[PDB]
Amino acid sequence: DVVISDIEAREILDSRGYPTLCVKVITNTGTFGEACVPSGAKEALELRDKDPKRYQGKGVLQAISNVEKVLVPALQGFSVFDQITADAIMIDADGTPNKEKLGANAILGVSLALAKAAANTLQRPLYRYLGGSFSHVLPCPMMNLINGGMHATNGLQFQEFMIRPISAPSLKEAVRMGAEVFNALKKILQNRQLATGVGDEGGFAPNLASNAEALDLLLTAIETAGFTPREDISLALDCAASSFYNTQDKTYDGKSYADQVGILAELCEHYPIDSIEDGLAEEDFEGWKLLSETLGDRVQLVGDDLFVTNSALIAEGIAQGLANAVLIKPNQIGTLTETAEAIRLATIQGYATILSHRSGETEDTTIADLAVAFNTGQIKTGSLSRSERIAKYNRLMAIEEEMGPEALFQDSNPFSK
């Protein structure tokens, strides 16, 4: 039997230039797996050094030390294949709900590198090791193209405007459709002398005046690339509505939650939007109730800040009838075991799940494997530039090819266009 023998960790930079860690788990046979940990811009504790003379306080040398001095003794000798056991051991070694003692980034690095070490030991694909023999669904992506809100200096209230290449027969064709719309948009922006520098996700933040102008521009880009909105490519939003919710007044840039729901409803009547993420604030439970009752029969309603990949919040959301899809960000919770339990709890209640990148990503592509492992049918992993995004699409295309006739590209949005 193959057991954990050592764990190495080192400090790298993420795609924004800030430190994070990569972790290598090594078995007693000399097999190993390596994974790196992303980071967002309210969740499991990302442990930073706070040394002001180093990376403005964002080093992760202490988390690395926790991997090497705490998790190594806690895990060595245990089977490389007992994923749930290893994750429980780390959760207990930390002892706190939010992983604030050892660092959720230290624990997630080990959690992912361990699964890969086991898969590499069996010489089996990670998605098959994690998801079993019937892992076979390639996800329909939601692809960022235009940014606003807190992610821009334009007049867009909402944070992200995405396309979904819903008519693609394959993931690789979904990628091409996305890339061609991206190229048409880039050229449209150049022709309009609007900014073409890209943001964290690899899409654009031109100076547009309103959510509707952004939606119109994506429609123009779709058609210019030669595709039909609604039939070939639909739209999705991330409002990140907490960003413009006044908790004292209970208003969204002056509007009641009922007004805000009316605004989203009108957009959905006039645009081929089939998914809305965080349309109301994370704690506006009456708003979410009205949003779910008003559009939950017609459009995918995704909780991101509402759920934070957290099984307790998901269960409370489902009991109250809120939303119909869950964003899954493994580092928000900190182990694969808890990520899987979030996915299972949502899926058996009829919710879709969507594997998601973070704004600070790395060259690690685990979330592509996780999306296939759990047959989620959806992923959210960025625009069509910058290799910390593209590498996930490249990994999905490799998975689809490796699976040959077993692959199925299949959107899990219940309400597709």
3-state secondary structure of 81: coil
Closest CB to Mg ion among residues 282, 369 = 282
Q: How far apart are CA 137 and CA 147, in angstroms?
A: 29
DSSP state of 380: E
Q: Which of 242, 292, 332, 362 binds a copy of itself (CB under 8 A)?
A: 362
Active site residue 329: yes
Report yes or no: 163 and 145 within 8 Å, Cβ to Cβ. Answer: yes
Q: How far apart are CA 124 and CA 118, in angstroms?
A: 9
State yes or no: residue 304 binds Mg ion (CB under 5 A): yes
Stretch that binds a copy of itself, among 127-135, 237-245, 280-288, 359-367 (CB under 8 A): 359-367
Q: Which of 283, 297, 401, 406 binds a copy of itself (CB under 8 A)?
A: 401
Q: Which of 393, 407, 411, 413 binds a copy of itself (CB under 8 A)?
A: 393
Choose among 415, 385, 404: nearest CA to 138: 404
3-state secondary structure of 383: coil
159 marked as part of a ligand binding site: yes
3-state secondary structure of 337: helix
Q: Tell me the longest C-alpha to C-alpha distance in the chain.
A: 63
Beta strands 160-164 and 234-238: pairing type?
A: antiparallel
Q: Which two tokens stand for residue 305?
A: 């800040």
What is the contact mask toward Mg ion in residues 353 to 392, using x (rule: CB under 5 A)?
----------------------------------------
Q: How far apart are CA 32 and CA 122, in angstroms?
A: 11
24 marked as part of a ligand binding site: no
Residue with tokens 């076979």: 136
Stretch that binds Mg ion, among 33-41, 253-261, 304-312, 373-381 (CB under 5 A): 304-312
Active site residue 69: no
304's contact among Mg ion, a copy of itself, none, with CB below 5 to 8 A by partner kind, is: Mg ion
State yes or no: residue 34 binds Mg ion (CB under 5 A): no
Q: Which residues are catalytic?
A: 201, 329
Binding residues for (2R)-2-phosphoglycerate: 159, 329, 358-359, 380
Binding site for a copy of itself (CB under 8 A): 10-18, 22, 54-56, 153, 172, 175-176, 179-180, 182-183, 193, 195-199, 204-205, 361-363, 384-388, 390-391, 393-394, 397-398, 401
